[PDB]
Design a protein around this ligand. Structure first.
Ligand SMILES: C=C(Oc1cccc(C(=O)O)c1)C(=O)O
Ligand SMILES: C=C(Oc1cccc(C(=O)O)c1)C(=O)O
Lengths: 284, 287
């Protein structure tokens, strides 16, 4: 019987927003300490919650709904301070004409944020419905659409300009409304894994920080390589990678707090839900 | 419509025998040009053959059966010159007592299983009653007299379980070496013919990146084994020895081994004894 220690099962968002981080994990060799699963952010959240991953990214809403069972990594997240570029509202009309109009969404956090903004900032109540991210399809059936990930980035930088569609950056809309940054996803460990294997959890956290730091220093190398496989060019990817904000300190947490307070009672978690952070090792 | 170019779908054997290569693909950044799939060798061969992968490792037998539709990469393979350490026969009795005896064959293997049957029948002259089952040494040893394992399971049987329980472990790479004086090739890297023709430069760059990644894996083998030992029952010395015993060359001496093995097993495996192996031709230059 092979009772040797086993690698942590670590998830990783397949979209461009975490491609530089993947570059970091590969260049540092960190990937060989992981049992990696690449998928979409909503699937990776499902897996971690139900126990198919030990550590991985969790879209903020799904983290808040499971905050008692997850422990978030400090100093790394997927967020923005102003525009986020990859979370948008695409609209054929000004936003203030969406009351009673049809708005298409996406296959959990950004959708709630868009609904928060439209209802509580602009004061419109649209007839929402969910459909797969297809800007061309959405524009025929609805007045506006909510896209995330690469689709929103494509809508923002390519499709939007080509077809003369207003693209509203949800991160900028939030900033304008509150002056705050925004956090869309965090990294967490399952509580039970964090408690059974504290040092593995700790070193996974440190390896994510090291890989994230390397991804910032070599962002140009990442964008050059990635441009060969994307409709986006190297400049566009470099701008995207550098606009993304991967910090998770005090200003980001307060943004999480206030967002939770405004959407909690209508999303499925307490407005004052507590976010437990992986405590660093004390020394003597 | 996003008509941009897409990454090749590249397979990768999940066992330890290709972990240093994985270190190479990650450290070189090559991984970010692949859409990688990790699996067992028999699954990856099925996937490439049916079209779920563009490029990937193919266990030799399955490559030969599909030689018209696959183009093998030169100068990289999974092989040995002597012992391979991770392709073995585990037996409670001497091999010449296996005639009519029960022998289990691990499901994930196609080449090593055929090689073992070749050796037992044509070298030792025994005809055992084989059956296929998933790789579980503890289970195999209770129901059968001998077992054929590959990958990490065979590596564990050879280095750990065998000595602990006093089981004879026969290295299939050495048995072949003794019999023929030749090295052996268990798996090659190939591109689908249709993918190689539609995307010649991508195919070439994937090949070149595999060579560079393999070369880095040899130079930093100790770093790979040190890191890998933390997650395995094997220690760093054992893994380092394993990685350096594995032979990743695929030149002229390795091909003759492929040729001769094909000739001896072809008419009993499902391909002509003189099946042609098409290799990715290098680009000529003229300055
Ligand atoms: C940068 C992004 O921000 C995210 C990432 C993951 C999930 C969500 C969500 O809203 O659930 C948002 C992006 O999607 O590219
Ligand atoms: C070095 C090995 O040789 C192999 C590799 C891949 C497939 C097979 C097979 O038997 O099909 C054998 C190993 O398994 O570690």
């Amino acid at each position: 019987v092979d009772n040797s220690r086993t690698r942590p099962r670590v998830g990783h968002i397949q979209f461009l927003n975490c491609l530089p981080l993947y570059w970091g994990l590969a260049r540092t060799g960190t990937l060989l300490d992981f049992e990696l699963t690449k998928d979409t952010p909503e699937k990776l959240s499902e897996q971690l919650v139900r126990g198919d991953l030990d550590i991985g990214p969790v879209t903020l809403v799904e983290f808040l709904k499971n905050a008692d069972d997850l422990v978030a990594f400090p100093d790394i997240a997927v967020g923005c301070d102003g525009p986020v570029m990859s979370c948008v509202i695409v609209s054929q009309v000004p936003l203030d004409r969406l009351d009673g109009a049809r708005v298409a969404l996406g296959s959990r956090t950004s959708v709630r944020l868009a609904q928060l903004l439209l209802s509580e900032r602009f004061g419109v109540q649209p007839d929402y419905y969910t459909c797969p991210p297809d800007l061309s399809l959405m524009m025929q059936e609805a007045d506006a659409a909510v896209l995330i990930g690469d689709a929103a980035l494509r809508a923002n930088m390519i499709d939007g300009p080509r077809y003369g569609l207003d693209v509203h950056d949800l991160g900028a809309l939030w900033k304008e409304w509150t002056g705050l940054p925004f956090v869309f996803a965090v990294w967490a460990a399952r509580r039970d894994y964090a408690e059974r294997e504290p040092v593995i959890t700790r070193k996974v956290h440190e390896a994510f920080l090291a890989s994230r730091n390397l991804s910032l220093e070599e962002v140009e190398k990442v964008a050059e390589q990635a441009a060969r496989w994307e409709a986006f060019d190297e400049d566009t990817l470099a701008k995207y990678f550098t606009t993304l904000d991967f910090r998770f300190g005090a200003p980001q947490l307060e943004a999480v707090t206030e967002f939770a307070r405004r959407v909690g009672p209508t999303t499925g978690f307490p407005a004052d839900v507590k976010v437990e952070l992986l405590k660093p090792l004390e020394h003597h």
